[PDB]
Amino acid sequence: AVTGQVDVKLNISTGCTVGGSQTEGNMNKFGTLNFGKTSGTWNNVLTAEVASAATGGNISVTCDGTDPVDFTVAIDGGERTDRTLKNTASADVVAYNVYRDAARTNLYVVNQPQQFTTVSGQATAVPIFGAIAPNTGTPKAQGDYKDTLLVTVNF
Amino acid sequence: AVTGQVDVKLNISTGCTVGGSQTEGNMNKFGTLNFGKTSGTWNNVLTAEVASAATGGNISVTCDGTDPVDFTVAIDGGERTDRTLKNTASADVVAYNVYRDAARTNLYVVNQPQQFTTVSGQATAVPIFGAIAPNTGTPKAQGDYKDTLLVTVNF
């Protein structure tokens, strides 16, 4: 019998809120990274942007304050922690990655707070640009591949 | 004068130990559930994970032996027994809950042994995922809200 304590805390004072999300039960549904349909072996880098579940556009984070606030954005490694989509039925995997800029260069490194700014009376967008490498080796099995990345807007 | 007996017992043989805790005086400090800063009325479900007081990551329970032991995890209802954080100065309360899975579905029911597995030469993590409902009604007073959940790793 090892009984222990867990201090719970919350500082209600002046915070920042994330728009574009829908409450899926008790977990915020931020959006979808839909690469679309594809064949077994694709030569072009498959690339799609996150579509917020609430509006359809990009996640719009706004801060409830007057002065500028510097908030951070961190995305985790997915269900299996290595950013791989898994086929619903078979065990095939599809490696992918999420970048922050339009040219697939600034990668959202696993469990890292990619910095962000937010200004007076405005909603800043959180671009989560997906990208998949060209698979010109083995044709992955037919079906639907999925993953649930947990995006962590933290301060 | 009602004098009575209390039998004390301890079976020293082959037990299981919880890592990630720090001994706060004579009580094991397991960790912190830090939801962060927030405004009076938040529309998004505030959500944070427990951070072990010893390492900063998740509580890592390991057992001492060779056969996989099945240990249980039970969390209580907090200081007031209804999972509410209380403002340090005023009497305002903030209802919350702790779940076991990443999607806020498998709730750690009050005083219930949520089952767990553990194999030899490995440490299993105890995910205590916090979650707070969207308060879009009354703005709670400014300040710090706290609670001390007692996590009970028992066999």
Side-chain angles (χ1 to χ4, degrees):
Chain A
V2 180
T3 314
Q5 295 185 127
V6 160
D7 209 47
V8 199
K9 279 184 284 290
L10 176 79
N11 203 272
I12 281 158
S13 48
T14 282
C16 197
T17 191
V18 179
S21 66
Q22 262 170 0
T23 60
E24 256 183 3
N26 291 139
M27 196 63 200
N28 310 297
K29 177 64 153 219
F30 276 10
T32 190
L33 197 44
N34 193 330
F35 296 112
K37 256 168 134 283
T38 190
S39 305
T41 58
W42 54 94
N43 260 21
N44 317 130
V45 165
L46 289 182
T47 44
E49 191 180 18
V50 67
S52 82
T55 51
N58 272 0
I59 292 100
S60 307
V61 179
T62 180
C63 277
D64 169 53
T66 292
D67 60 354
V69 181
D70 179 70
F71 83 98
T72 70
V73 164
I75 306 198
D76 82 345
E79 283 191 352
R80 298 146 277 291
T81 79
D82 59 359
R83 306 218 163 138
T84 42
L85 297 105
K86 188 179 164 317
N87 175 226
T88 310
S90 84
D92 295 29
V93 291
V94 161
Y96 72 97
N97 225 330
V98 280
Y99 301 81
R100 162 165 181 205
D101 79 323
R104 271 47 168 204
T105 76
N106 192 14
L107 208 156
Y108 270 114
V109 193
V110 184
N111 300 324
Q112 291 225 14
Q114 272 259 347
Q115 309 289 305
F116 266 108
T117 60
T118 283
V119 305
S120 292
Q122 202 169 346
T124 304
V126 163
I128 293 164
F129 282 119
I132 294 194
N135 162 26
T136 190
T138 52
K140 311 311 183 69
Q142 283 209 328
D144 198 50
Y145 285 59
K146 315 170 98 87
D147 207 329
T148 298
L149 277 168
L150 271 65
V151 157
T152 299
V153 187
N154 71 277
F155 324 118
Chain B
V2 180
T3 314
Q5 295 185 127
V6 160
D7 209 47
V8 199
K9 279 184 284 290
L10 176 79
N11 203 272
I12 281 158
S13 48
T14 44
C16 197
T17 191
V18 179
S21 66
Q22 262 170 0
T23 61
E24 256 183 3
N26 291 139
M27 196 63 200
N28 310 297
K29 177 64 153 219
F30 276 10
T32 190
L33 197 44
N34 193 330
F35 296 112
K37 256 168 134 283
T38 190
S39 305
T41 58
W42 54 94
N43 260 21
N44 317 130
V45 165
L46 289 182
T47 44
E49 191 180 18
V50 67
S52 82
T55 51
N58 272 0
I59 292 100
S60 307
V61 179
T62 180
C63 281
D64 175 55
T66 72
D67 53 351
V69 192
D70 179 70
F71 83 98
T72 70
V73 164
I75 306 198
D76 82 345
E79 283 191 352
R80 298 146 277 291
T81 79
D82 58 359
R83 306 218 163 138
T84 42
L85 297 105
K86 188 179 164 317
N87 175 226
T88 310
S90 84
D92 295 29
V93 291
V94 161
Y96 72 97
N97 225 330
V98 280
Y99 301 81
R100 162 165 181 205
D101 79 323
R104 271 47 168 204
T105 76
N106 192 14
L107 208 157
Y108 269 114
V109 193
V110 184
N111 300 324
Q112 291 225 14
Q114 272 259 347
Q115 309 289 305
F116 266 108
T117 60
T118 282
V119 295
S120 188
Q122 201 161 349
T124 304
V126 163
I128 293 164
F129 282 119
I132 294 194
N135 162 26
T136 190
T138 53
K140 311 311 183 70
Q142 311 264 99
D144 198 50
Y145 285 59
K146 315 170 98 87
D147 207 329
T148 298
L149 277 168
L150 271 65
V151 157
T152 299
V153 187
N154 71 277
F155 324 118

